[PDB]
Amino acid sequence: QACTLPNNDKGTCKSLLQCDVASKIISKKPRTAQDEKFLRESACGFDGQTPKVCCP
C-alpha cells in the first residue's frame, strides 16, 4: 500500500524485510534504539507483533 512519509510526499508501505535499504540496515551491523524510533516513526501501523515500514 502507498503511505505518506513524515515529510508528506507520498510513498510505499511494506514490512521491514522488503525494502533494499531497509534490508541493508538489518544486515549492516549497528542497531541502536535510535534506529527503532526512526523505523517506528516511519511505520504505517499501530501493531507490535506485525512491524511495518514506509519506503518512498
CA–CA gap between residue 3 and residue 43 (Å, rounded): 9
Q: Could you tell me which of 43, 34, 39, 32 has the C-alpha nearest to residue 3?
A: 43
Domains contained in the chain, CATH given:
1-56 (3.30.1640.30)
Angle, CA 10 vertex, CA 2 and CA 43 arms, to 5°? 60
What's 51's DSSP letter? -
| Residues 34 and 25 sit within 8 Å (Cβ to Cβ) | no
